[PDB]
Write a protein that binds this ligand. Structure first.
Ligand SMILES: [K+]
Ligand SMILES: [K+]
Ligand SMILES: [K+]
Ligand SMILES: [K+]
Ligand SMILES: [Mg+2]
Ligand SMILES: [Mg+2]
Ligand SMILES: [Mg+2]
Ligand SMILES: [Mg+2]
Lengths: 495, 495, 495, 495
């Protein structure tokens, strides 16, 4: 039903033993970094750009519009210091989240086998006996025996009980639990809007005026939720890409229809693991990546990729393989959440993420990858897709150092990225929206151009920029595509 | 040079959404659990057996012979309560380890940019300014600029300095550091024996008399180290399997020759990541697994697989994919270290490890896996290997529920396991060594038998045991191999 | 719709330049020889056996029961002189043939553009102006413009005309035309029974009492024609195999249903080329072979394979490739018609046919052939088919010199033959019908045995026969199958 | 050593039953026709053009320069009546032929077992007892026991004897033998120059002044023979292509080096079958085609393809499969010899040859063919070859109706032809040599153009010609290549 396969690797002793020698920003896999107090300064944001940050994620689960607007201003200043590293701006919606209230002493130590009751009144200041929940209809949604998870599942509670005003639970494990933590109610219908009023106002009064490029919509359940977001964006938001977050059972069941309506997908592994059991999450990840790859839809793999680096300067062995395998699975982007937003090693986390990406990208057999993609796609295809596919096959056959794509809307660049070239895709566009939105596709780096007139010289200009960025050198071949109906091969010579 | 590939997966909505319904011990991937105070009781050891523990690892980096012998006695009592779950016993050598001394207050808080000097005298009781190192020749081995890592790299120190008696370093990050922690000296020749006197006495005076089945030899660097271990074992230890641990550059460079001499391999990812940089470790893992798979040599993937479950009741998303990917890569065994030896959730860690294994095993396309193995092996092969390969292909072609292997030495079962059947391999043997040593191969479960006389009825007895264990039912086919030159297919009927 | 593929060949300079060194009867492709006056003597029939003849074809389009019974008697005497070369006996029905009458001077020279009329009265003795036709309803079946072909299309006539009693045609080419030649009426419904009274009496009063093994039924058009033949054979003829001849449009359209009812197929290329145009015949041949191969149904490729050797001692270059390509396409049998029945070089034709077969069989890559067959067959398959397939894969993996099959009905041998082993299939059977009927399957040679009791020694006896026939030698492996649920591999040793 | 494979076919009931509906000259396989008295008239030569003739073969084994010059003049008149069907002109050298002398009564009936002596004196007028041989050193080259074949092996003679002046042989079969027939001396070193004085004067005094495009050099044995022909052609003959004929053991042994020096190959099956035994010839054909295909060198399959049509209006079943299989093997050209030079049905033979080609070309799976070619060629390849390969893959992916190639020298067109597109390759060139020489490559049809200036409009002109030739229609896509570094895709629209 869902054939899923990692790219074959050719792993050499040289690659294992010889250190990496390329700029981190030469990587093909792109990185979404969540902003927060740990990277609030312009100086730290510039360091994250240099380490490999490509898209900035504003998590509207927390903070006010003024908090995010101040962050956005420091990002714009960081952008001015790296004007050719064009960052995409992503708004991540709160969605139908459920959270615990506040605590009498800010933290509580629940003990295993102890009782814990939760109350519908959100202004209660709780303690170890008692805590508030932001979901007013909690008593009517849970039936006895259901499990309640708090703080990314750091503690779980079995619903022994329910009444009109509250629920009684037994703590299934001991844990220290902080303020305002998330709660999951697996296998329970939660009566909250998928797109809330707050969500609609974050999209309309922040993402549109501020110029965000992506809406990452939480807990999406149907193709209709996506169509509603597109309709709210309206003509003024027509260039903002919709990225549904798949993090519950409904989003899995309806994934094919959600994907068809979407501009791309985020694999929201934290909530997904709490809604389906954790052992299943890798199945969902590899299947969504495979389906997105076949459709040419970009996908972001998210959550706990390098989690221990919130506290440690190096990741665990499982964290290393998680980043590499997400690359080898076919992800376009990988993501950091607390590792950049609130941890002690944000630059180090982005740095090692880029280094793992580079190792995983370098070991791939791109001949077999290309053949396996073409083997899995029905023909005839459109002229545009066939020319883009030939740019990739040609580049691999001669070991070209780049593919230059002239693209108004980005469509040509997306089609080339679908065929996963070993080399960088240098997309040229006159549209500001296009050069930032393309960041969600693997291997695409964009340059804003004034125009496409004199395609010969625009290509020769782009070749000049590529040599200046050390992406190509005398003796290299480059592929150029425009039209999407023309492909040219140019050898770089001494002039 | 090293083609490496994961098995293709067929991932269905049903598998993602429907809970697992099989006994945890029906899994094919086997689990090595490190014993320690967290699983010291007979009752907890019995729970680890039920959760999926197959091999018990005694880590001789710590503790005395009396400590390990007491543990061994509680394991034997746990074995008596699960007499048909025959556990393998593995001794893991200390090897040429380097460790910090003790501390004036048992713990120290090093601060970034602060100075730290280490001294050759191991009886010094250190503090934040000063710590002892067990390697007397530390000053003569490091030159200025080398990096010293302590406590699994939780802190790193740059060697600013060296003298006859000590080294001066600058702390590169702040960390709390405990007692007796390991130290790595990457890219430095350490002058310590690969097989120390202590190692030789642990092998000769504990593993041989106590009946251990495997020696996992630390920091192996050459085929000669393996030959020396085989020679020390001698005729009395001829049935003890040698498992080199690959955890340094020399072991990577000489891996092919080490493997040829070995009975199997342990991927020792903790030290390997500190000796080669962490971003490279996944390359080394996938290449060793691929080479071991092609040779029919069993491999154990080790270290930080479910690390956060030392403290948390559920693993991170990266930990889940790490176990599943190690299965999909082709590992025979996965391993737990502190998660079982000293953590707060040892039964839960083994339980979720088994559940991830079952999900990864279930999504594999075993048709493609079998074809890719036969495509990669030169023919003609031996009669024994060709019959074993046909048992697997036949079982897959008719969806047999098991392959029964009559085997004196285990050789037949190892050859069947090399071809990675979807079904369990039930190995019957009269040898006590064989039924425990086979635990390191994927999918092999053993039964001690009195004899092979009347092969018809020994097979019919094994069929009876398999129905009693719910491994097969009326209507199933089973494959039986013996000789290694005969294969029979038997349908289970009502009688 | 119909994927068709030749086996891949590995062609070496050694094979092109070094002469063949094996007995002609060691070939896997079997030969059907049509008997006639050119091989009427016992001595010539013995020479055809030695040259590679496996099945004797009695063409009931010509001759009386007494003529064929005398031939049959000389074949039985030839069989007594080669008692271990068990020949199959095939009756080829006349079917709804149409033939010209006799001639005033036995031959006529039609001239292009000259008129020629044909008359419904079969006793007319014709000449160049006028000839009789055995189909009484010729005038009512042809409409003006249809083409009439005579003597294997050596002349064609356009139907200019039709009346109640006759047809007028213009000769489209000049030709000398003999007595009693066949006529084709392409794209015209001929009103003759598919199974005529004469056919039913040849089957019932000759093939059943004489012990023929195959009925090759001419011009079969539907699965119902096959069912009628099976019903006429009845219980007394239950062991006689039905081989429909595909030689008209209806047989092509209904081929899948004809095949399902059939015991095998004959590609009757002479008539097929006249009913569909000649340029299409190779399409029909390769598609029927592919479908028969996938179903495990044996197929005979017939007609004009070595035609010029009716007159010349060596074949043309196109005749050589035709035999080799029919082998590489996957045919079980190839056939000779006038080359053995009436030509001047019958022993030479069978000899060179065998030599071409041996060259084509020797260049095949049997690894790829086996994989392509298993890739094209749905699983699960029956236990019997899976064991037979494993006998082939095992034999290829160790370069076994033969597969021994104990088979009552032949079913096991047919299943092994479906997977096209490089080595001979030695089928042992106690049934006289089985040991002769299996001759239509590629690579199967049979031995009549008294019994299967003591399977160990029956196999050891068959091994002894194989060494005596130089099919195996000390150092070889052989595969043995019986049950169909057991496979054994035996190495031949000095004893 | 020599992997050889036919293209996979997808054979449908529709193709078997529906008649061909395309112009014969739309075929991709090209036809070499040997000229002779049967096609001497301008009218018959025009009919052969319309039937599919692409290259005219002048066989200098027979006739004088005046005979061939008169033929050449009638070909030029036929060319003037079909000025857009640009024919290639091929001179086929006599080479070191051996022939019988003349006969007292022009024909002789040798009888099997009768004696026959041959004499070194070529003016002897022989009979059934005695015949002359053109090889003066026959007595010193044959030793007793060697076989002498005469008239394409229609009779063979065993050398019982040898003296200084003559040889005595026993006729091994009865045959009627005409005048001036060829003789083969298999496995005997013949002392004749590979390139004789007559050959050098036919090349220099006929092929160069008359404007022939190919020299088909008989009995080539080494790369040095090819280099000598290139040197004789010199600067004036630099545009004449050298096609060695492979027809003896030395040419097989040295085929790889001969091929490297050659512009293409002719498989000379008549002599090859007499020098190696006939059963081997199909091995040699399929291996040479495979090697030529991999190198991009065009190959002609020659001799006895439709032989019976020298006398019959329709071919045998083996002749049909021989043409189709030579196409499916990968031949660029197929050839007719006596079928056009001296037979009774020259237009019919060329017509049915074209029709078989069209059926074989239409059933090919061009997706698998393309992948199997790219799978078998080492990369990196040249920029030119990679762009040509992408023109083919793109055309197949969108079902383009043609590939337009702007080419000065033909190199671009040859590289496209190497990848065997399903569609026609329309090559445009300003060179007269190029537009005629390209005829030896499959699928290439050329147009002479004035210039390549304004590539946009030259392409739009070629598109206009293609619609006028019914090679493309509104709605089709076409591929255009020039540079070899640019590929464009153009959709044909209403204008
Ligand atoms: K959020
Ligand atoms: K250890
Ligand atoms: K017949
Ligand atoms: K010639
Ligand atoms: Mg979430
Ligand atoms: Mg270690
Ligand atoms: Mg017929
Ligand atoms: Mg010749």
């Amino acid at each position: 039903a869902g054939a899923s396969m990692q790219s074959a690797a050719n792993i050499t002793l040289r690659q294992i033993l010889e250190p990496n020698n390329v700029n981190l920003r030469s990587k093909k896999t792109h990185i979404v970094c969540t902003l927060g107090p740990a990277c609030k300064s312009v100086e730290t944001l510039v360091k994250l750009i240099d380490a490999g940050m490509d898209i900035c994620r504003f998590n509207f689960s927390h903070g006010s519009h003024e908090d995010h607007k101040e962050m956005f201003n420091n990002v714009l200043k960081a952008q001015e210091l790296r004007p050719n590293c064009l960052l995409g701006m992503l708004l991540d919606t709160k969605g139908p989240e459920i959270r615990t209230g506040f605590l009498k002493n800010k933290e509580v130590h629940l003990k295993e086998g102890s009782k814990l009751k939760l109350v519908t009144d959100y202004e209660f200041l709780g303690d170890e006996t008692c805590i508030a929940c932001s979901y007013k209809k909690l008593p009517q949604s849970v039936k006895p025996g259901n499990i309640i998870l708090i703080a990314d599942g750091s503690v779980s509670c079995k619903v022994l009980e329910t009444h009109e005003d509250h629920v009684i639970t037994e703590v299934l494990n001991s844990a220290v639990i902080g303020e305002r933590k998330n709660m999951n109610l697996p296998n329970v219908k939660v009566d909250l809007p998928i797109i809330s009023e707050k969500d609609k106002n974050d999209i309309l009064n922040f993402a549109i005026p501020m110029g965000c490029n992506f809406i990452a919509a939480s807990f999406i359940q149907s193709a209709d939720d996506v169509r509603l977001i597109r309709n709210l964006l309206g003509p003024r938001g027509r260039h903002i890409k919709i990225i549904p977050k798949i993090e519950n059972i409904e989003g899995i069941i309806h994934f094919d229809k959600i994907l068809a309506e979407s501009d791309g997908i985020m694999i929201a592994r934290g909530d997904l693991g709490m809604e389906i059991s954790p052992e299943k999450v890798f199945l969902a990840q590899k299947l969504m990546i495979s389906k997105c790859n076949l459709q040419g839809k970009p996908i972001i793999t998210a959550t706990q990729m390098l989690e221990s680096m919130t506290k440690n300067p190096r990741p665990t062995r499982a964290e290393v393989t998680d980043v590499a395998n997400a690359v080898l699975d076919g992800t376009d982007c990988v993501m950091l959440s607390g590792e950049t937003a609130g941890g002690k090693f944000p630059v180090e986390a982005v740095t090692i993420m880029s280094k793992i990406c580079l190792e995983a990208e370098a070991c791939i057999d791109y001949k077999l990858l290309y053949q396996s993609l073409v083997n899995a796609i029905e023909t005839p295809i459109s002229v545009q897709e066939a020319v883009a596919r030939s740019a990739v096959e040609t580049a691999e056959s001669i070991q070209a150092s780049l593919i230059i794509a002239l693209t108004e809307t980005g469509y040509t660049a997306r089609l080339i990225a679908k065929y996963k070239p070993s080399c960088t895709i240098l997309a040229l566009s006159a549209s500001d929206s296009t050069v930032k939105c393309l960041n969600v596709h693997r291997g695409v780096t964009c340059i804003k151009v004034g125009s496409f007139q004199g395609t010969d010289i625009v290509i020769r200009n782009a070749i000049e920029i590529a040599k200046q960025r050390n992406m190509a050198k005398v003796g290299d071949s480059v592929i150029a595509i425009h039209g999407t109906n023309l492909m040219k091969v140019v050898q770089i010579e001494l002039e």
